[PDB]
Amino acid sequence: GTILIDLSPDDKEFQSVEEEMQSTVREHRDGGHAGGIFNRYNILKIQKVCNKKLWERYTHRRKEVSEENHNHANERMLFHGSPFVNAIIHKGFDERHAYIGGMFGAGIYFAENSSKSNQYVYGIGGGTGCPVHKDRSCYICHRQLLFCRVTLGKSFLQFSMAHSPPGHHSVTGRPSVNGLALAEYVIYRGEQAYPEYLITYQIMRPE
Ligand SMILES: Nc1cccc2c(=O)[nH]c(-c3ccccc3)cc12
Ligand SMILES: [Zn+2]
């Protein structure tokens, strides 16, 4: 039931999604090992992901969480990078999309920094890089990220499928060492995220 609608680059919605993608690149402590070396992206396409059944699954859960949290869903727009992006946009998020070994347990991980999600496009640790050249810093191959609507509800703050900590709907990984890193978030129910935008891009080689 999923259809993908291309956004025009002239569209304010394209421009705002692109700006969030570009403006949340940072340097990574691995020197680029997992995600490659770059300061910005070449955005090739931004598509709106439209699926009525998946949207209603999301809004149903969102209302549940809101009602458990003084009418506050605590909804964010966050990045997700994954080898399973095609399954996700067709079938929705589920336990198969969880990062089993993540530092906050087996859940589905989201980033404020697009460059954090970029590290997972080719797998954990960047896997073996792009399928064509086996290059985690490939500047040729097209990558995809999701920009997702995520319900956090009451989030457990960790200074840094399983179940959420009791009394909570998600976990927040607050960086405590790298002062430039933005937060990361984990949900333990696939129904708490909707993959709203599919972004196709290249990383760009610094000049
Ligand atoms: N640990 C993370 C922090 C912030 C964002 C992500 C992410 O986008 N994907 C992933 C990811 C996605 C699929 C399978 C394994 C890991 C992890 C991640
Ligand atoms: Zn490549």
Distance CA 158, CA 104 (A): 8
Cα-based angle 7, 192, 79 (whole degrees, multiple of 5): 45
Q: Which atom of ligand 1 is nearest to the CA of 83?
A: 13
Distance CA 48, CA 3 (A): 8
Q: Calculate the CA 29 to chain-centre distance.
A: 19
The experimental method, as deposited, was: X-ray
Q: Which atom of ligand 1 is nearest to the CA of 145?
A: 8
Q: Calculate the CA 22 to chain-centre distance.
A: 14
| Widest pairwise Cα distance in the chain | 50
The residue type found at 37 is: I
Contacts of 52 (CB under 8 A, 6+ apart): 1
Domains and CATH numbers, the chain: 1-207 (3.90.228.10)
Determine the distance separating the centroid of ligand 2 and the alpha carbon of 129, expressed in angstroms: 7
Distance CA 129, CA 135 (A): 4
Binding residue positions for Zn(2+): 130, 133, 138, 141
Residue with tokens 């680059």: 9
DSSP one-letter string for the chain: --EEEEPPTTSHHHHHHHHHHHHT----TTTTTTT-S-S-EEEEEEEEEE-HHHHHHHHHHHHHHHHTTTT---EEEEEE--TTHHHHHHH---GGGSBTT-TT-SBEEEESSHHHHHTTTTSGGGTT--TTT--TT-SSS-EEEEEEEEE--SEEEEE----PPTT-SEEEEE-SS-TTPPPEEEES-GGGEEEEEEEEEEE----
Contacts of 111 (CB under 8 A, 6+ apart): 78, 79, 80, 81, 117, 182, 184, 185
Which protein residue's CA is at the shortest distance from atom 16 of ligand 1? 99
Residue with tokens 């909804």: 75
Q: How far is CA 53 from CA 66, 114, 145, in A?
A: 20, 27, 22
